[PDB]
């Protein structure tokens, strides 16, 4: 049973991807923008679930490689680090395509990245956390989208909109957006129940997400998917650590007051 407990805590520590309507709308919109090479910018709140949805859109088109030609990668997903320069961004582009870089100038990196970007037939350039990179690199991404005809999606918090607003071309070129919703409503309750069935993966104790539990989780998460995930995982792990088979009211109260 101790081995089972370790397996349970390890599984609860690891996060999963429950496909819900938010990510469904997102990759539908992404496919629409991809079929037309339309460069947009998906925006949303923090801790709301944009990175996971972009990740899912990345894995669904797992590149299928030919026997002797470069693997064709339709969707490129990048999350450049803080104050990412042009050399760093190009390094990341050519590294995701599995082309190790060669020491050289910024022009050399640009040329190699362009070569490998046309070579693999890339369709999408998903730049998550697009509020980190310097504005001397937005010209480079503009040139990529202009000449190579690759639909670029700039992903980030609402601060990304402020970052691009002070610029001139990047704001006009990247204007289509898809704001991530708050999810509050009956769909939120559906989310809680679906999470209970799938992610918790606990024996059926008929918790059913009663009205009191819904009120506690509404007061706790404030609509955030990430907060919901964190609270659910913390409550499950705390119940399993103290021997409780299911999740009681005291643990939700404890985790809710610990958050707020």
């Amino acid at each position: 049973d101790d081995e089972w407990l370790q397996a349970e805590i390890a599984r609860l520590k690891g996060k999963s991807i429950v496909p819900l309507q938010q990510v469904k709308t997102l990759h539908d919109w992404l496919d629409g923008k991809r079929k037309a090479r339309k460069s947009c910018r998906v925006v949303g709140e923090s801790r709301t679930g944009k990175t996971v949805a972009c990740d899912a859109y990345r894995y669904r088109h797992k590149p299928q490689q030919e026997a002797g030609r470069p693997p064709t990668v339709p969707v490129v997903y990048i999350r450049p680090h803080q104050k990412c320069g042009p050399k760093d961004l190009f390094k990341k582009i050519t590294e995701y395509l599995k082309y190790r870089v060669t020491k050289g100038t910024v022009s050399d990196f640009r040329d190699r990245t362009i070569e490998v970007l046309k070579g693999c037939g890339v369709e999408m350039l998903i730049i998550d956390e697009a509020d980190r990179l310097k504005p001397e690199t937005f010209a480079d991404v503009r040139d990529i989208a202009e000449d190579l005809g690759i639909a670029v999606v700039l992903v980030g918090t609402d601060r990304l909109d402020a970052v691009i607003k002070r610029d001139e071309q990047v704001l006009e070129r990247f204007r289509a957006h898809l704001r991530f919703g708050k999810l509050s409503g009956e769909d939120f309750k559906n989310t809680v129940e679906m999470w209970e069935q799938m992610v918790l993966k606990l024996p059926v104790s008929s918790n059913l997400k009663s009205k009191e539990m819904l009120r506690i989780l509404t007061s706790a998460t404030e609509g955030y998917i990430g907060r919901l995930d964190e609270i659910l995982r913390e409550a499950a792990i705390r119940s399993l650590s103290r021997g409780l088979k299911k999740i009681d009211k005291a643990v939700l109260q404890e985790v809710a007051k610990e958050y707020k």
């Binding site: 082309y99 870089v101 060669t102 020491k103 050289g104 050399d108 190699r112």
Partner: protein, 155 residues
């Protein structure tokens, strides 16, 4: 990314072309092959210590061209060559875009195939040609005249 040699291609030209296909510096190719600075020496046609069997086989392992074929990118035994000036037949380049090792033979002044004097500098602007490893495009680095078009100015 592997490349097939062109017939008659010089070792310097081939090494640089392999490096460009793989975004490698000369030092990077040297480390991949385990012989370091030797690569850059060969690219500048400096073989005071002629290429050894072990060095040729080390490069052969990376580029996947046999040492025997690599030796045909250098003059045969007894054939003197020059590291300078770097020379060019533009009519040859139009047919096959490489520097030929024969153009560095001390005895060679005319292309036999085209019956033209070979060039020792750009005939448009007089800029000397770089070492063949650095022939990134087929044009004069100064005036940008294509090597293939220089055939029209050969005598």
């Amino acid at each position: 990314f592997l490349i097939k040699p062109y017939e008659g291609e010089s070792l310097s030209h081939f090494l640089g072309r392999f490096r460009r296909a793989n975004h490698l510096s000369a030092s990077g190719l040297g480390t991949l092959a385990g012989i370091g600075a030797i690569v850059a020496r060969w690219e500048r046609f400096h073989f005071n210590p002629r290429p050894s069997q072990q060095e040729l086989e080390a490069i052969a392992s990376v580029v996947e061209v046999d040492a025997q074929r690599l030796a045909q990118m250098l003059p045969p035994a007894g054939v003197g060559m020059q590291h300078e000036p770097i020379r060019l037949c533009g009519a040859c380049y139009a047919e096959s875009p490489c520097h030929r090792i024969e153009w560095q033979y001390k005895s060679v002044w005319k292309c036999d195939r085209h019956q033209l004097k070979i060039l020792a500098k750009c005939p448009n602007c007089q800029a000397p040609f770089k070492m063949p490893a650095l022939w990134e495009d087929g044009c004069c680095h100064r005036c940008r005249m294509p090597f293939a078009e220089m055939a029209k100015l050969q005598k």
